[PDB]
Design a binder for this molecule. Sequence first.
Ligand SMILES: *[C@@H]1O[C@H](CO)[C@@H](O[C@@H]2O[C@H](CO)[C@@H](O[C@@H]3O[C@H](CO)[C@@H](O)[C@H](O)[C@@H]3O)[C@H](O)[C@H]2NC(C)=O)[C@H](O)[C@H]1NC(C)=O
Ligand SMILES: *[C@@H]1O[C@H](CO)[C@@H](O[C@@H]2O[C@H](CO)[C@@H](O[C@@H]3O[C@H](CO)[C@@H](O)[C@H](O)[C@@H]3O)[C@H](O)[C@H]2NC(C)=O)[C@H](O)[C@H]1NC(C)=O
Ligand SMILES: *[C@@H]1O[C@H](CO)[C@@H](O[C@@H]2O[C@H](CO)[C@@H](O)[C@H](O)[C@H]2NC(C)=O)[C@H](O)[C@H]1NC(C)=O
Ligand SMILES: *[C@@H]1O[C@H](CO)[C@@H](O[C@@H]2O[C@H](CO)[C@@H](O)[C@H](O)[C@H]2NC(C)=O)[C@H](O)[C@H]1NC(C)=O
Ligand SMILES: *[C@@H]1O[C@H](CO)[C@@H](O[C@@H]2O[C@H](CO)[C@@H](O)[C@H](O)[C@H]2NC(C)=O)[C@H](O)[C@H]1NC(C)=O
Ligand SMILES: *[C@@H]1O[C@H](CO)[C@@H](O[C@@H]2O[C@H](CO)[C@@H](O)[C@H](O)[C@H]2NC(C)=O)[C@H](O)[C@H]1NC(C)=O
Ligand SMILES: *[C@@H]1O[C@H](CO)[C@@H](O)[C@H](O)[C@H]1NC(C)=O
Ligand SMILES: *[C@@H]1O[C@H](CO)[C@@H](O)[C@H](O)[C@H]1NC(C)=O
Ligand SMILES: [Ca+2]
Ligand SMILES: [Ca+2]
Ligand SMILES: [Mg+2]
Ligand SMILES: [Mg+2]
Ligand SMILES: [Zn+2]
Ligand SMILES: [Zn+2]
Lengths: 482, 482
Amino acid sequence: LVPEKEKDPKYWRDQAQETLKYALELQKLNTNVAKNVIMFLGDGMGVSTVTAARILKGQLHHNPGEETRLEMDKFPFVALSKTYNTNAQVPDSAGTATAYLCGVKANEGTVGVSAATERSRCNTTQGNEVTSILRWAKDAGKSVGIVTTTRVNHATPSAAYAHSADRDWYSDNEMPPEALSQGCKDIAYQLMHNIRDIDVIMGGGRKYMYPKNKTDVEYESDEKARGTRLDGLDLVDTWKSFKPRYKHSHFIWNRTELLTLDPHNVDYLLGLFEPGDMQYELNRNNVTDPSLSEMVVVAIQILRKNPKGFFLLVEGGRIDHGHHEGKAKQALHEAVEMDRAIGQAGSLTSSEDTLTVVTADHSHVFTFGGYTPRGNSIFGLAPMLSDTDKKPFTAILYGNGPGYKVVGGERENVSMVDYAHNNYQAQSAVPLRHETHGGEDVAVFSKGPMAHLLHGVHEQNYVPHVMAYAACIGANLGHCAP
Amino acid sequence: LVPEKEKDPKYWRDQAQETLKYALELQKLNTNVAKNVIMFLGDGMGVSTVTAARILKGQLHHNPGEETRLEMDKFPFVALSKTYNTNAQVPDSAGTATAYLCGVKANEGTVGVSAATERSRCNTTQGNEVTSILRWAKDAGKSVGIVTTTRVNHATPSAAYAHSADRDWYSDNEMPPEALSQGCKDIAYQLMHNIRDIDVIMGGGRKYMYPKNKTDVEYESDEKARGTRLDGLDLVDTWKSFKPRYKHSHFIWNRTELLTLDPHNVDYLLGLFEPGDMQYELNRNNVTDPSLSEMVVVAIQILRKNPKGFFLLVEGGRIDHGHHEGKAKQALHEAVEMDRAIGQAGSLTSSEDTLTVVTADHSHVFTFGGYTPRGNSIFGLAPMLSDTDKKPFTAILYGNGPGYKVVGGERENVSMVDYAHNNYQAQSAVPLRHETHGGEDVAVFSKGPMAHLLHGVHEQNYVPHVMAYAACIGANLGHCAP
Ligand SMILES: *[C@@H]1O[C@H](CO)[C@@H](O[C@@H]2O[C@H](CO)[C@@H](O[C@@H]3O[C@H](CO)[C@@H](O)[C@H](O)[C@@H]3O)[C@H](O)[C@H]2NC(C)=O)[C@H](O)[C@H]1NC(C)=O
Ligand SMILES: *[C@@H]1O[C@H](CO)[C@@H](O[C@@H]2O[C@H](CO)[C@@H](O[C@@H]3O[C@H](CO)[C@@H](O)[C@H](O)[C@@H]3O)[C@H](O)[C@H]2NC(C)=O)[C@H](O)[C@H]1NC(C)=O
Ligand SMILES: *[C@@H]1O[C@H](CO)[C@@H](O[C@@H]2O[C@H](CO)[C@@H](O)[C@H](O)[C@H]2NC(C)=O)[C@H](O)[C@H]1NC(C)=O
Ligand SMILES: *[C@@H]1O[C@H](CO)[C@@H](O[C@@H]2O[C@H](CO)[C@@H](O)[C@H](O)[C@H]2NC(C)=O)[C@H](O)[C@H]1NC(C)=O
Ligand SMILES: *[C@@H]1O[C@H](CO)[C@@H](O[C@@H]2O[C@H](CO)[C@@H](O)[C@H](O)[C@H]2NC(C)=O)[C@H](O)[C@H]1NC(C)=O
Ligand SMILES: *[C@@H]1O[C@H](CO)[C@@H](O[C@@H]2O[C@H](CO)[C@@H](O)[C@H](O)[C@H]2NC(C)=O)[C@H](O)[C@H]1NC(C)=O
Ligand SMILES: *[C@@H]1O[C@H](CO)[C@@H](O)[C@H](O)[C@H]1NC(C)=O
Ligand SMILES: *[C@@H]1O[C@H](CO)[C@@H](O)[C@H](O)[C@H]1NC(C)=O
Ligand SMILES: [Ca+2]
Ligand SMILES: [Ca+2]
Ligand SMILES: [Mg+2]
Ligand SMILES: [Mg+2]
Ligand SMILES: [Zn+2]
Ligand SMILES: [Zn+2]
């Protein structure tokens, strides 16, 4: 390939010098207070995923891809974070969630409780609850918002509002008899009850709000889509029942309604768009369900109204479930979508008053290599066959996962399959039903007020302490001297 | 496990707040000029590797390891860098070397020349040479030094002094006939000939300095270790012949001589401790060959004398051949050794005048996962057996390494192997003679004067432009503007 400009050294020299110029300008720091704080979480968005998603964004624009700049690559400050859990070398989504949201690391499986709480032991929850940055923001008067493509009671969003001993306790249906008897409340219940005045809530997880065997509006025929609540409660009503009557509060379940809403009119918005998790972006129906980008836009429009500010938590989410199934095309595409929503949030907010942080809870066993040439598709094959089995191999390869396919002592001859298909599973070293997480460190991109405080290699619990300090919320309100 | 201190939230909160205080203290930036510039290059040290080497270091101290802090983890500033070559999506060791040393991105295989030079096309070299930061320093009066565990003529260090159309041209013995007739000179020749006043040069690669069929001093019996220069030159003598007589210039080949040298006496040092690349740190002979840290200590002592300053290029090196051979235990120990050398250099220099940068040329398809518990050995197994083949699997798994083991249609039952052996090769998805590189981005840790300028995600060619600007060398000397 080699573009003709990339053959000339002056091109690279000017490129670096201009980057040097801006780097020198960034010595003048943004010490302003963070009126708003927005946190993007790519579930499973390791540095390997970020690079591959960069190539994909550019390749979808008929470019080689390596030289493309993701919206998160345009953030000025980058830092790594150590994801290890108190119990787990390779962490889960729940324990990490307690770290970057509540400011404390916890055991695998727990949500919003310290390491003293034992998983599935409900009687150890009491006294060990840890509040999240969401609460600190609402307690400081700011509006709060949660947007995700996974269930609203999934592990990543649940750490914002709930304090449960097990992340699997989505509704009272999944709770064991002892847990209910000890007084534990399910995650869905805690969504409406813990913090009642949560301004914006959008995402999947509809079935966990309606009583059991109740028929779902979008899929009335689906037995899976039926409600799960043994309590016989309409939590959707319970949502508005805690809201003041004089305040306009709407519940929506499909995209047509979402686009029709006027943000100046809506003071509280609850949107459950699917019984379970929302579909992948490659499988989304254009008319019925909304994309993450549009969902983030309407949220900011609603939340911008509060003069005290707002906190918004967005989760790409589905990247995790994508890597879990070994379908790199699904996961990588989800990552590009979140990047678009990050760029849109840049047009809806100002860098002077809004602190934006893009990070991930953990990495994955996703590997992308094979000495591919410049421009070679991110889902493409290696240039040469393996010296051993004389068979070609994909550039994308997983360590462990369901992509391991060995036919009778021979690895799959990939030249005859559709490896570019959306649901193709790259080869694996160890067969597993689902691919595992990764203990590697993840990146933290930060732009805005006090983003230079997210420097270097530090722990994962450190991230929310920076945001809270910049916004003058939480425990350390020293950024604004009284 | 669950450390008892980590069960209390106040522990994490205090620790995070402490990180905040120093983060704010780093708002006072280091605008001093860089008298000295030290660059550590972990050959193949991806984000997956730094985390694993972190776990290893702490575990060698009978600790869990995840909480351990590598010397590079204590650097204040981290940044990601784009490694792609002009010809290759997944880069090689040579083209990357041209970027972070000479400031321009190049084709795979070319060293010290721009993207217009074609691999093995010797007649395209003239006019396309790009100078390195090593040259800018020696042209600026500072002493210069190269320390590596690979051959002194290998790909990574060669970009410092040489401008060759092919990295395989170690000596004239490996050069094709047309290259010689077109006037191309080998790398080893260019080491002594391109830059005559290179103060310190240490590493392997003896055979490329001595005439053909000669005898290696350490191994008189090995025919492979016998010299290879068909031109019949003693490049060691060529070294001293260019050095001034009034300046003391010593050549050493074993550890006993190196530790006996007095740095106050030595003005020029050439130390070749092996015919080829030096041994792994796990197989190094204590008396004959020195560790990288020992080489760095004495090297810094010699170069510190120059009052105008010094530049030192260090390469852990053997990390790459460790990943290539699929033996993670070899590579990881190599990485920890490089980290120790970073700590040694930290006491020998001051952060006020010395800019230290640690980066990598590329990544590897090396990943570790499996939801292992806290402390589980980095070379240990997963907690549970795979649901598919009902056999255990190692935590470390390679994408496409030689570790692929199928015994009669089934992957190897690892309960029967010594996965802790130093030469064990973790399992892979695709069998190859050597494991491939990785298109993932690498980290750049920076401490010292103007280290805050290596921020965010930028290209790989940008690293030397920061160092040159801080040291007031190269084209842009505006940092010391009158
Ligand atoms: C993996 O499967 C592929 C099938 O896609 C095998 O490669 C295929 O090889 C056949 C012959 O071996 C090729 O068909 C024809 O071969 C003759 C050679 O005499 C030639 O006249 C034709 O031009 C044509 O190539 C076929 O094209 C080729 N397919 C591809 C996609 O390359 C491959 O051998 C299998 N690998 C192993 C290790 O079994
Ligand atoms: C992978 O290798 C391991 C280790 O050789 C195999 O596990 C071994 O399986 C045998 C079955 O013949 C076990 O023997 C049985 O053990 C229990 C008590 O341990 C007892 O109920 C029986 O009387 C019988 O002796 C053996 O202990 C076990 N070894 C270890 C170390 O766990 C495993 O089967 C191999 N997997 C495959 C798929 O071949
Ligand atoms: C709406 O979604 C449908 C299907 O999900 C898309 O329709 C495709 O349109 C392209 C050309 O635009 C055709 O090649 C495909 O065959 C169509 N597929 C189907 C199943 O109808 C449509 O592009 C989407 N519209 C958007 C995203 O605005
Ligand atoms: C999405 O949801 C709205 C929910 O109201 C649906 O619109 C309703 O349609 C029924 C009859 O089907 C009418 O009686 C209601 O008045 C409508 N509601 C509103 C607010 O207009 C709508 O059908 C759905 N849109 C899609 C794409 O399914
Ligand atoms: C020199 O290297 C040797 C390894 O060759 C180290 O001594 C080894 O100690 C272990 C510990 O049980 C023994 O298994 C080996 O047999 C020993 N080998 C030899 C050759 O003594 C020794 O500690 C090293 N010394 C230093 C100063 O690093
Ligand atoms: C390393 O190098 C030194 C010098 O090359 C070696 O010391 C020599 O030892 C021999 C005996 O084998 C003597 O005849 C020479 O006079 C010594 N040279 C000097 C300059 O003193 C030494 O043998 C080597 N050490 C090792 C472990 O190989
Ligand atoms: C709660 O649970 C366990 C029994 O599962 C028991 O150790 C203990 O007595 C109870 N209380 C606390 C505070 O853990
Ligand atoms: C360089 O190399 C080849 C030698 O085979 C020849 O075609 C050509 O004349 C030369 N090209 C240039 C630009 O010197
Ligand atoms: Ca829907
Ligand atoms: Ca030796
Ligand atoms: Mg999630
Ligand atoms: Mg090398
Ligand atoms: Zn996760
Ligand atoms: Zn390399």
